[PDB]
Amino acid sequence: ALKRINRELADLGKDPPSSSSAGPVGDDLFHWQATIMGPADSPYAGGVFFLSIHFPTDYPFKPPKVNFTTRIYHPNINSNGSICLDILRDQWSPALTISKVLLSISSLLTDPNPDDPLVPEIAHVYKTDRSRYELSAREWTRKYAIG
Amino acid sequence: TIDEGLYSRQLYVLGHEAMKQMSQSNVLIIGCKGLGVEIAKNVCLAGVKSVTLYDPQPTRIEDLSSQYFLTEDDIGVPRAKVTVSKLAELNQYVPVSVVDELSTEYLKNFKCVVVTETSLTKQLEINDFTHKNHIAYIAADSRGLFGSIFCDFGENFICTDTDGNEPLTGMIASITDDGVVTMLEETRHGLENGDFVKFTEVKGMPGLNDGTPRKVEVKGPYTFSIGSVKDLGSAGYNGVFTQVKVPTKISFKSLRESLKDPEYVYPDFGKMMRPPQYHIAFQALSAFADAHEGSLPRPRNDIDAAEFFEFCKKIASTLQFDVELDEKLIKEISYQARGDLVAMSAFLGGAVAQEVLKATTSKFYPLKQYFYFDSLESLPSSVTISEETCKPRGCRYDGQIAVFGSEFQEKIASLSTFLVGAGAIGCEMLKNWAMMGVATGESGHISVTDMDSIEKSNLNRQFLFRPRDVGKLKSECASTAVSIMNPSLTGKITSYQERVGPESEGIFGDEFFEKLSLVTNALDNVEARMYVDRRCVFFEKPLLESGTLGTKGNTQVVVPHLTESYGSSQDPPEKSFPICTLKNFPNRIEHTIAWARDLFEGLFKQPIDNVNMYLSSPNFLETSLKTSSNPREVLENIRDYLVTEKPLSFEECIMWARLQFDKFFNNNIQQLLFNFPKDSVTSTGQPFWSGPKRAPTPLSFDIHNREHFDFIVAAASLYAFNYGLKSETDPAIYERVLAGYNPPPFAPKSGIANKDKQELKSIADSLPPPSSLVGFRLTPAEFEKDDDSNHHIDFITAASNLRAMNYDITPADRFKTKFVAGKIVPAMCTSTAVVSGLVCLELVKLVDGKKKIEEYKNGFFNLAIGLFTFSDPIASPKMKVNGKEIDKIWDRYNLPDCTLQELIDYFQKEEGLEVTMLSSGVSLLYANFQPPKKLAERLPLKISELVEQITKKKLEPFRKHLVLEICCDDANGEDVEVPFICIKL
Ligand SMILES: Nc1ncnc2c1ncn2[C@@H]1O[C@H](COP(=O)(O)OP(=O)(O)OP(=O)(O)O)[C@@H](O)[C@H]1O
Ligand SMILES: [Mg+2]
Ligand SMILES: [Mg+2]
């Protein structure tokens, strides 16, 4: 629990994630505010996305609650920030670190998964009109993910 | 006609058909001592047709050792006559009678016959009749720390269900022409060899949909074989299989035939040579009683022990038993012949009542046939047990003194226990403590806490409560009832109405917890169990945990500095479905039930909360515009529930219900099909709506349909409740109002500055000012499953069934919907009795202060299959710190309220460890990677002041200690775990 969380925090401090920066909110060890940089080879380039992580009391036996804060135009992310990630609902096991979760979310941002979407309209736009999806993603990542 | 308001929890264990067959059966009980009264109580709570008692023996004082329906004013009255009046109140659907004389032919009037405290000749006479006439015969006996059960249901007993598990069902991926059936990806069927399954909704092989059972040949965890399906087809795609359970025939033997060649059931595998000893010993007890005018051997008497052993030798010679008699164990049985313990009585009564239910309902696998049990590890060793100490003293504890002695009675009488919870297990534990005489001395005390109130469904398994007590607090009623049972507990019991948690530390603090002797948990949730476990670990108090689930049960004992704590073991977590499965692509009824619950909350609870908060908080809009995830949603909810769609009559509520039907069952499905048509393909070329995704279809509102009408009624009623209007149920008004409805046109939409902020402001200004509406509040709908007049479960069932009709899922009835939505845990009275008996058998070990870890037994049992097992507790892990042996769980550092720098230097010098992290609760007090300025600002502060500053909350006046978690590294840099720190304020 607390000891594992502090070990993860020290690992983050010792080895910088470069593309990510997670840390406790204030001085609470069960509430973290992480930052993800938009991948270069993605419509979200040049953007900063903030995520809120709530560690459960039974951590690591239960998955942390990761929710987006910045608005994002993605097929697998809805307006409330919920993420359709398998490792956070029922595939969670006490062997995954927060750096792994952030890397998985970055990979998800690199390429969406429209075959099993969470926002059907965005997935339909992505599958049918790719250029319009790109334009909308750039517009959103500039209106909300910058400044 | 089954009263589901009372048998709600029991029907989830037995079922409707089982209880229907159970409510037509008569049970006769011979013997009304502690075991007999326990069996009768459990049977009356179960719900059999009637119970008849037969016990003309006059009451004696020692009979009060386990009979809780007898008082000291009843000495000299037949036990049945004074027990029937108190038994007739447990259940109003089960009449209780008494027969003065018993004839053999009279036995034809009953379905089951239970025999206790009867000689072997009379048992043979009764069984020689009840065998040939197909009458179930159960015989039970309890001698001190030993017990025996015998079951004989006839030579042609038919058992429909042999394990109590739900039929195995699953979804299929493909079926080959050779019968090889494969499950979906990463799905296990769970079938075994020799099972029969039926296939439904199978595409490509319609012949498999007839329902004829077929053999199952398991080939792996994911695939099995069904045989030859060549004639029906070549390959089958998808489908759902369901296991078929066939009845089994069990043939029992009579008592006379089974005396010579018994068939034992072993409750433990560490001692499998004992049941043969007990078989001889109990018959020797019967012979000794017959040869001494029904007088059992005197407690701890050597002459009677020798005579009993001679009888045992004679019996072993007569029956051609080629087993060497163990003199020590047999003489132990002789010594405790006159014992009467409430724990053994409760355990055996629960088991025997379950056997009675098996006999009546023809369900579950029964004992076949002899079951001999002993708990001899509970015999005290730190006190003197002899003939002088165990002689009767003419008090109600004679049955227990005859086993434990007077010194152990004095040890029990000065206990100071703490019972958390007052549920079924709590009531049983209180009864056992009252009978045992716990906390009846000068220094004894009992404390019981529970914050819940008595409901109707709790009366089925919590026998200390009555229908007149519905709505009252559990702790007060339980304390009053147990004070009535044992008048010596008047003033020795304190009842609280506090929830045990972080907020109750002002009452259950150091002063309260330093006077206890042990803590017993009777909770039903894991969070409270973990909290109480942490408190007991910190204060070093013994803990007794016990849990039940239907017919399964377990008991665990936690001993300071000896065994591991409750939290050291992890249980399987609850399964939560993915959000994308619930939102768009459900394939099971549970997904639709979860979606219906979410819809209920989002329609009748959250918008009402937003409207109430807007009318109460003067600055709600500004906070919401920059705090809430979707401020536009909040503004739209406020506008719709205040001005746009505020009903003025129930007709407008009906119109709103129809509109919501269109919104959630006709338009969203159209939009989803517009996004992903039925003929769409994935990126890999496979069809989209294949496998776990089912193609939906919009519903057209038909008033004549039952589900549509039920949804309309429930939604309109809930909306009227939100607005406090007068709801109606006559179909005439619904049919008249909904006739003249014009559905607004809807076509799916493809999509294609601060203007939006301006529009949000536009909505903002249109809202009425808070001053215009003062005292106006909308009533939210708080979910309540147990009440059937609030239209909560009705709405959830209607919505779930409608969404199932959207996705062609098989709808479920209101019973299963209430089971799933309400998270109802199945519960039984027999399981509660068994767990209480086991816990009270461990309590006497705790009182005696046994030191070895092999003398304690964690227990597990499953009454559906007659399985009992006992295993030693796991020892607490050890560790090496600074070349010393440290207990991981039961050790701590005791330090004064020194400054942070002093604490770090102390750990550097004494333990030779460098502190790298120090936290208290959920706050990080000190870390090695923090910037130097912050540390230099925090170093010279005391621990209490540091905690107050970081947590921004002053320490309470009753706080007397701080528990700190510290992570420190060795000199070489290797991380080494250390026990927590206890700062004394
Ligand atoms: N944290 C807690 N502190 C104190 N008492 C608790 C706590 N959690 C649960 N309890 C009590 O534990 C008892 C559990 O008993 P039980 O589960 O049989 O009853 P119930 O939950 O009211 O009934 P049911 O689950 O059958 O609807 C209840 O009295 C409940 O009030
Ligand atoms: Mg309750
Ligand atoms: Mg409960």
PDB file of N, CA and C and ligand atoms in Angstrom, chain B residues 9 452 458 461-462 474 523-525 823 825, ligand 3:
ATOM      1  N   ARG B   9     -34.008 -14.003   1.967  1.00  0.00           N
ATOM      2  CA  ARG B   9     -32.639 -14.501   1.902  1.00  0.00           C
ATOM      3  C   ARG B   9     -32.584 -16.016   1.770  1.00  0.00           C
ATOM      4  N   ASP B 452     -27.533  -0.584  12.749  1.00  0.00           N
ATOM      5  CA  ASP B 452     -28.648  -0.891  11.869  1.00  0.00           C
ATOM      6  C   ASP B 452     -29.923  -1.104  12.682  1.00  0.00           C
ATOM      7  N   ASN B 458     -35.014  -9.756   8.412  1.00  0.00           N
ATOM      8  CA  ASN B 458     -34.034 -10.206   9.390  1.00  0.00           C
ATOM      9  C   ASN B 458     -34.614 -11.190  10.393  1.00  0.00           C
ATOM     10  N   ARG B 461     -33.668 -15.403  10.371  1.00  0.00           N
ATOM     11  CA  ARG B 461     -32.484 -16.060  10.904  1.00  0.00           C
ATOM     12  C   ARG B 461     -31.948 -15.409  12.170  1.00  0.00           C
ATOM     13  N   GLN B 462     -32.543 -14.313  12.624  1.00  0.00           N
ATOM     14  CA  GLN B 462     -32.137 -13.628  13.848  1.00  0.00           C
ATOM     15  C   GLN B 462     -33.260 -13.841  14.858  1.00  0.00           C
ATOM     16  N   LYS B 474     -30.865  -2.929  16.768  1.00  0.00           N
ATOM     17  CA  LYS B 474     -30.546  -4.334  16.997  1.00  0.00           C
ATOM     18  C   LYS B 474     -29.849  -4.543  18.336  1.00  0.00           C
ATOM     19  N   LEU B 523     -19.521  -8.964  11.414  1.00  0.00           N
ATOM     20  CA  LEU B 523     -19.796  -7.999  10.364  1.00  0.00           C
ATOM     21  C   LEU B 523     -20.146  -8.714   9.061  1.00  0.00           C
ATOM     22  N   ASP B 524     -20.496  -7.927   8.041  1.00  0.00           N
ATOM     23  CA  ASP B 524     -20.832  -8.463   6.728  1.00  0.00           C
ATOM     24  C   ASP B 524     -20.093  -7.753   5.600  1.00  0.00           C
ATOM     25  N   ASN B 525     -19.099  -6.926   5.913  1.00  0.00           N
ATOM     26  CA  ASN B 525     -18.329  -6.214   4.903  1.00  0.00           C
ATOM     27  C   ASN B 525     -16.853  -6.299   5.259  1.00  0.00           C
ATOM     28  N   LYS B 823     -27.426  -6.638  -4.544  1.00  0.00           N
ATOM     29  CA  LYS B 823     -26.253  -7.294  -3.968  1.00  0.00           C
ATOM     30  C   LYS B 823     -26.634  -8.106  -2.734  1.00  0.00           C
ATOM     31  N   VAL B 825     -26.901 -11.012  -0.246  1.00  0.00           N
ATOM     32  CA  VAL B 825     -26.072 -12.157   0.118  1.00  0.00           C
ATOM     33  C   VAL B 825     -26.994 -13.252   0.647  1.00  0.00           C
TER      34      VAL B 825
HETATM   35 MG    MG C   3     -25.668  -7.737   5.492  1.00  0.00          MG
END
